[PDB]
Design a protein around this ligand. Structure first.
Ligand code: ATP
Ligand code: ADP
Ligand code: ADP
Ligand code: MG
Lengths: 368, 87, 70, 59, 199, 58, 70
């Protein structure tokens, strides 16, 4: 006799779920419709005040006007140059805005490094720790700098041989700090129209200034950082004087990477900026073992694998190479249909990485 | 007093959600770019990428695909007919 | 070598008006405004009463003139 | 004059040292000696920290 | 009636514009193709997650409200490198380089068609493969055959095509090409004559 | 003051320059931002007084 | 009536005004001005605008529609 107890009960449950989805339809079709009765406010930038109710605004590439406060805008929160939005009809300032713009700087601030940790670094110890001395302590604990009586350092340069986790240490630092981050490709900085490189760096550094605490990181700074076509040099100047000269208060630190520290313009290498230079050497045999074990856990490694043979065969390998080894080992595994990897697969991978290394032979690299 | 003059813009990117309400992109040089559609007197059978299109003054709906241009310098490489040369 | 240090020192300590625009900042896509913005900075300096214009890294935009082939 | 420092330190030793180093180098070396003291978790800075920073700076 | 008002007030022709970031005091910034700039307190007929601050969007000509998000296009060259021309070269038709073909296939094809063996082993499959050897051996043919048999998206380009004159245009081209490859997801980029730019 | 208000109701009519009096009541002029046009003159219509490049108010 | 008229003239120079550049004085009551919109206009001078402040470099404010100098 459950038919009458359950049929209309399920009917009401289903109809209430349908009502809940149709309420979402109603709220969306009403909310966007009452959003339809709106007009885009003009975007522009203010100049000197004249009175408490008279302000000059440049309306972007259009003309410039004088206008007044709507009712609810703090006059003191307006400064010459602050970004504002105005009524289309009367041009009176509808709202102030967070200063400055640019999708490119967003793209420089919204790329994720992935999940990394300092333990997931190949035992660069000192190096890593030094980079924490120059960044972690200044941001989290400036009180110790104040008590000692020293100014926190601004920046560090990663250098040394390639493939030594050049980006990896920065990825770790970014993933282990809750602060605004700006990765930029140095070559991606420069653009043709003359002065867009300088203005783009300007906007980037204003972004960092207005989003403290921030970490700006340039990879491959030698793209434009070399000693002094000439537009590259002027871009270097823009960096070179933005990087100190107007003030120093910043809760903002710059990390730089280079595959050629020697060619870097001496002006950059100046101790006041570039506060430290961290050499990330070719990984040692013990360091190579450390890296191996760091890239070993997640593998479906099987039986027992004697890493020291890999180490003493992988002498002179860049840390990165080690990753290859592991991947190639799985290749042998997929060529053996194993759900596992054995010691001799690692031996084969090491010997093939050695085979590749001769083509990959080391550059004509000169460190400082 | 009857016929509307047509402004000239370049075409792009038939939006083509399902090929019966296609819509298009147009570029009025130095002025703007718009999403537009066709006036039903013309059909997508005559519209492609670029295609040199012409629209009206206010609603900018596609009224005509305009003929090709002699700019691409192909004209100065042309002989265009049987040369005055024999074997 | 410790000169922009002195630049910021005089900028802060001065009683007269002071403007700080680096030389490299003087650039543009849109051709021609370079000279005008330079002249705008200088005229603004004049109207601002006795003032000191500071320009850093002028070497970027003050290299010895040469055949401007581009 | 800004830092805590110790009586033992011979600044004149680093003064007479022939190396040509900018005032930038000097601010950096004071900063690095302070950071060495912080690593030891002390606010006083010792001459050994100055030595370590001095070889840290220059090259 | 809400839907039919909204439909009859799409107005059909509308401007295009470039997206600029959002704010909470939800409300976004826009730059027109007329190089005018506007702020929308309400974005409009697209939800927040359709947006990327840098996207190309169709906006109301009069009220400037966002009403559509659009495919971007990428320069024109990069918009020319996508190979939907679909090569048809077959591995059986390769002249005896089978010992190499497998080395490429397990490095490329199965990273698409399985992706599960490598993560079953818990490792990332190979990401970069360099064909190398003197000319006239089959590198381009092998790349085109792999483009053929996979049914994936093929992005062929030559290194010399990126020796472009303008100061930064090559970097922009490379970035846009990789962005297009990401947008096309199971896609294979081919860099013929990397030496021309890998100097 | 009344006529002041009333004269504050028309518009600037921009600026142009005469180049040829191709015909009476039909002057060729060149405007500041835009190009060239055929333009007539007010009831004073002293066209022959107008030398080219004189710069005029429309 | 005079007070009504003068409150009207003051209402003219209220707030929603464009910016331009004073170019030259056509007559004692009218002048050529250069708007930041790009176009230049033959524009009435507002009588209260007291003349010695004017020079060809004097930035000025115009009524939005009549473009009158205010
Ligand atoms: N005599 C000094 N006393 C104190 N600090 C000094 C001295 N000389 C240099 N410094 C420190 O080193 C820095 C030297 O840099 P400087 O003032 O020349 O500016 P800069 O921006 O590095 O120069 P440039 O424009 O040449 O690149 C100072 O900012 C200061 O912190
Ligand atoms: N010391 C290390 N510890 C762990 N991984 C490393 C180390 N050195 C290199 N790698 C590997 O190298 C890769 C990145 O190398 P990296 O030098 O950052 O590239 P780039 O030279 O482009 O910055 C990572 O996948 C990482 O696994
Ligand atoms: N074994 C082969 N079987 C069939 N065709 C081949 C073979 N080897 C080479 N070819 C042809 O010759 C070309 C090899 O040169 P390619 O790989 O294009 O490099 P490059 O452009 O430097 O010569 C291929 O495009 C292919 O068409
Ligand atoms: Mg200096």
């Amino acid at each position: 006799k459950l038919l009458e107890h359950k049929e209309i009960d399920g009917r009401l449950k289903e109809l209430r779920e349908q009502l809940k989805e149709l309420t979402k339809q109603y709220e969306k079709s009403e909310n966007d419709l009452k959003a339809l009765q709106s007009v885009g406010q003009i975007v522009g930038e203010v100049l000197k005040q004249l009175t408490e109710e008279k302000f000059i605004v440049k309306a972007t590439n259009g003309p410039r006007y004088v206008v007044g406060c709507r009712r609810q805008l703090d006059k003191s929160k307006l400064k010459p140059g602050t970004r504002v939005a105005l009524d289309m009809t009367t041009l009176t300032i509808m709202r102030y805005l967070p200063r400055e713009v640019d999708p490119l700087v967003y793209n420089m601030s919204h790329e994720d490094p992935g999940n990394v940790s300092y333990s997931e670094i190949g035992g660069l110890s000192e190096q890593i720790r030094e980079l924490r001395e120059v960044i972690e302590l200044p941001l989290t604990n400036p009180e110790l700098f104040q008590r000692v009586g020293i100014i926190p350092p601004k920046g560090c340069l990663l250098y040394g041989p390639p493939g030594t986790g050049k980006t990896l240490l920065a990825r770790a630092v970014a993933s282990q700090l809750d602060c605004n981050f700006l990765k930029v490709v140095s070559s991606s900085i420069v653009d043709k129209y003359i002065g867009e490189s300088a203005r783009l760096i300007r906007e980037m550094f204003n972004y960092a200034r207005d989003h403290q605490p921030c970490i700006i990181f340039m990879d491959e700074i030698d793209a434009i950082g070399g000693r002094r076509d000439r537009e590259i040099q002027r871009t270097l100047m823009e960096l070179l004087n933005q990087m100190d000269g107007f003030d120093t208060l910043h809760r903002v630190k710059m990390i730089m990477a280079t595959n050629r520290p020697d060619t870097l313009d001496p002006a950059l290498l100046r101790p006041g900026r570039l506060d430290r230079k961290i050499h990330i050497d070719l990984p040692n045999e013990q360091a190579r073992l450390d890296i191996l074990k760091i890239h070993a856990g997640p593998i479906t490694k099987h039986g027992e694998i004697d890493y020291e043979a890999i180490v003493k065969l992988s002498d002179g390998f860049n840390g990165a190479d080690l990753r290859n080894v592991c991947t190639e080992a799985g290749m042998f595994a997929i060529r053996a249909d194993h759900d596992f990897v054995v010691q001799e697969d690692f031996m084969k991978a090491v010997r093939k990485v050695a085979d590749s290394k001769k083509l990959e032979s080391k550059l004509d690299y000169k460190p400082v | 007093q009857s016929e509307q003059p047509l402004q000239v813009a370049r075409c792009t990117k038939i939006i083509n959600a399902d090929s019966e309400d296609p819509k298009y992109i147009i570029n009025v040089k130095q002025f703007a770019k718009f999403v537009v559609d066709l006036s039903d007197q013309v059909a997508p059978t005559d519209i492609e990428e670029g295609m040199r299109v012409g629209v009206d003054r206010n609603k900018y709906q596609i009224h005509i695909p305009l003929p090709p241009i002699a700019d691409p310098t192909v004209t100065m490489m042309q002989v265009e007919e049987k040369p005055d040369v024999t074997y | 070598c410790g000169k922009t240090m002195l630049a910021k020192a005089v900028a802060h300590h001065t009683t007269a008006a002071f403007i700080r625009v680096v030389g490299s900042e003087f650039v543009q896509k849109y051709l021609g405004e370079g000279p005008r913005m330079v002249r705008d900075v200088f005229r603004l300096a004049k109207e601002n009463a006795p003032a000191i214009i500071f320009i850093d890294e002028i070497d970027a935009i003050a290299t010895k003139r040469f055949d401007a082939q581009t | 004059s800004k830092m805590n420092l110790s009586e033992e330190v011979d600044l004149e030793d680093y003064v007479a040292r022939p190396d040509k180093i900018s005032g930038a180098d000097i601010n950096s070396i004071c900063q690095e000696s302070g950071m060495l003291a912080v690593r030891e978790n002390r606010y006083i800075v010792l001459a050994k920290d100055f030595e370590k920073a001095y070889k840290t700076v220059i090259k | 009636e809400n839907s039919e008002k909204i439909k009859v007030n799409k107005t059909l022709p509308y401007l295009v514009s470039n997206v600029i970031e959002l704010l909470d005091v939800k409300c976004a910034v826009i730059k027109t193709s007329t190089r005018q700039t506007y702020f929308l307190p309400v974005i409009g007929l697209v939800d927040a997650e359709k947006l990327k601050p840098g996207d190309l969007v169709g906006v109301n000509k009069d009220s400037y409200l966002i009403l559509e998000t659009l495919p971007t296009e990428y320069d024109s060259r990069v918009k020319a490198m996508e190979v939907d021309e679909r090569p048809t070269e077959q591995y059986s038709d390769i002249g005896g380089l089978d010992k190499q073909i497998q080395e490429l296939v397990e490095a490329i094809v199965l990273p698409m068609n399985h992706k599960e063996k490598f993560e079953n082993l818990g490792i990332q499959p190979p990401k970069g493969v360099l064909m190398y050897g003197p000319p006239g051996t089959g590198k381009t043919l092998l790349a085109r055959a792999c483009a053929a048999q996979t049914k994936a998206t093929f992005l062929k380009l030559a290194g010399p095509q990126l020796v472009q004159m303008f100061i930064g245009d090559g970097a922009k081209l490379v970035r846009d090409a990789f962005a297009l490859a990401k947008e096309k997801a199971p896609s294979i980029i081919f860099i013929d004559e990397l030496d021309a730019i890998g100097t | 003051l009344r006529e002041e208000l009333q004269l504050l109701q028309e518009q600037g009519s921009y600026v142009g320059e005469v180049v040829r009096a191709m015909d009476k009541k039909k002057v060729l002029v060149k405007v500041h931002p835009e190009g060239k046009f055929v333009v007539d003159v007010d009831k004073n219509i002293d066209i022959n007084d107008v030398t080219p490049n004189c710069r005029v108010a429309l | 009536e005079f007070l009504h008229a003068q409150e009207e003239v003051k209402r003219i120079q209220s707030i929603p005004l464009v910016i331009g550049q004073f170019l030259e004085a056509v007559d004692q009551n009218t002048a050529i001005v250069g708007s930041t919109t790009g176009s230049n206009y033959y524009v009435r001078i507002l009588s209260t605008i007291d003349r010695e402040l004017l020079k060809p470099n004097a930035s000025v404010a115009l009524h939005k529609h009549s473009n009158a100098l205010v």
